Design a protein around this ligand. Structure first.
Ligand code: GCP
Ligand code: EZZ
Ligand code: MG
Ligand code: MG
Length: 162
């Protein structure tokens, strides 16, 4: 079966761990346990083919270059009530682009915490950013599970079709 190396990147507290744990274990982590780094594996059927996902759940915090070289696709997560995390996406893409030496790297822009009210980043702002990069934009909630499978399986598809 085909193996996919996915990397979940993004600023502190955006929900990188909650999204990964929701896809792997089907439950929401309510507490905030800051991540050093964890990796999870899951065997799933995507478009009739059995896939092995190896997902790297990174720290929001120089030591990011090693996983960017190995990573095949990147879930670039920001929280829709965290303007700085959305702005930080530009820096993550520039670093990934530099390490991979390529303008066409599989990525999906994810606006997490879509269950929360009073958003500070509009969907239109994130759609415009994703359009400038040529990548999909998907909103998610690790709390309700909305869009979680869609975000990861859209990224698997982006890698498979690269
Ligand atoms: N309302 C809501 N809260 C969420 C959502 N996803 C994560 N959270 C909350 O945000 C906080 C941080 O989530 P966490 O998954 O640890 O984020 P992270 O980006 O992995 C944190 P670090 O960067 O330190 O690893 C937690 O309290 C968690 O429950 C979401 O979709 N909705
Ligand atoms: C092999 N797996 C059990 C772990 C794992 N899953 C991944 C998914 C995407 C990208 C990288 C990885 C890795 C590691 N392989 C690396 O090259 C690397 C660099 C820095 C790290 O922190 C971790 C890894
Ligand atoms: Mg985390
Ligand atoms: Mg504006």
């Amino acid at each position: 079966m085909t193996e996919y190396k996915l990397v979940v990147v993004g600023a502190d507290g955006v929900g990188k761990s909650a999204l990964t744990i929701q896809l792997i274990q089907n439950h929401f982590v309510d507490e905030y346990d800051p991540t050093i780094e964890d990796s999870y594996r899951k065997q799933v059927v995507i478009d009739g083919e059995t896939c092995l996902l190896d997902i790297l759940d990174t720290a929001g915090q120089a030591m990011r270059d090693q996983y960017m070289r190995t990573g095949e696709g990147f879930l670039c997560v920001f929280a829709i009530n965290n303007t700085k995390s959305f702005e930080d996406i530009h820096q993550y893409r520039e670093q990934i682009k530099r390490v991979k030496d390529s303008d066409d790297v599989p990525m999906v822009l994810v606006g997490n915490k879509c269950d929360l009210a009073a958003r500070t980043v509009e969907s239109r702002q994130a759609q415009d950013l994703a359009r400038s990069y040529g990548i999909p934009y998907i909103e998610t909630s690790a709390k309700t599970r909305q869009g979680v499978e869609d975000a990861f399986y859209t990224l698997v598809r982006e890698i498979r079709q690269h």
